[PDB]
Design a protein around this nucleic acid. Structure first.
Lengths: 83, 74
RNA sequence: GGGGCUAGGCCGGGGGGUUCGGCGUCCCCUGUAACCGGAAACCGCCGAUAUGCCGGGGCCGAAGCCCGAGGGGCGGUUCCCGUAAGGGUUCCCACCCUCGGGCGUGCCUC
């Protein structure tokens, strides 16, 4: 799976929406993440996006939240149209 | 249990989160070809869901996602 | 208990379409912290022991894995009432828990 930089997750997610206009669903899972990498900080959130076939993800933490929040919130708005 | 009054849906969602944040997850699903979207929030016992095809919600929702990161992060 | 191994396990699951039937490429509904690469509807691996094949990697490691019952829950679906919107209902079911079984719980060392 594609674990990406906070910044690059957006240019990917934005490119994903554009594949799934004439068809396909686009999911965005978002949850609190404890850094776990196998079966102990808790200050991180995790975002997965997928169209059923290609998966992308990224972890956002305090340092990059204000930047992300804005460009993501602003991203969604520009791509969740047709309503 | 689906909601209609968005502003209540949030009021539940955030409580469901606050109750067990490392359990609770939050899904969003958009489908341009049907011109509608859905928003789900759930730990694996309780489930809260909100479907809509209304442009006005995108803002509430983006400012909800925006609201939740904060709390997960800090 | 600590250390070194190996057997093994996980890296998704389900519904539709199609099939004589079981997987896959297609469509759809959904999980994970969690796989990369290749081919495949003139078809690819299969035969009720069928629940994919080939190539490469990571993690876990005697860890687990599988079968059954119920409960939570999602998306479908059967049937019935209604003119309709709706309402009741049958059977599946991602995801989660409880209980009950089956195989395994190995080798070396301090």
């Amino acid at each position: 799976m594609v674990l990406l930089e906070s910044e690059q997750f957006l240019t990917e997610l934005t490119r994903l929406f554009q594949k799934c206009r004439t068809s396909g669903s686009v999911y965005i899972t978002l949850k609190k993440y404890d850094g776990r990498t196998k079966p102990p900080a808790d200050n991180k959130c995790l975002l997965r996006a997928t169209d059923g076939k290609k998966k992308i993800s990224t972890v956002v933490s305090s340092k990059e939240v204000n930047k992300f929040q804005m460009a993501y919130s602003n991203l969604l708005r520009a791509n969740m149209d047709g309503l | 249990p689906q909601y209609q009054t968005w502003e209540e849906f949030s009021r539940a969602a955030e409580k469901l989160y606050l109750a067990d944040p490392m359990k609770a997850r939050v899904v969003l699903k958009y489908r341009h070809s049907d011109g509608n979207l859905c928003v789900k929030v759930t730990d694996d016992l309780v489930c809260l869901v909100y479907k809509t095809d209304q442009a006005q919600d995108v803002k509430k929702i983006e400012k909800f996602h925006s609201q939740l990161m904060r709390l997960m992060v800090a």
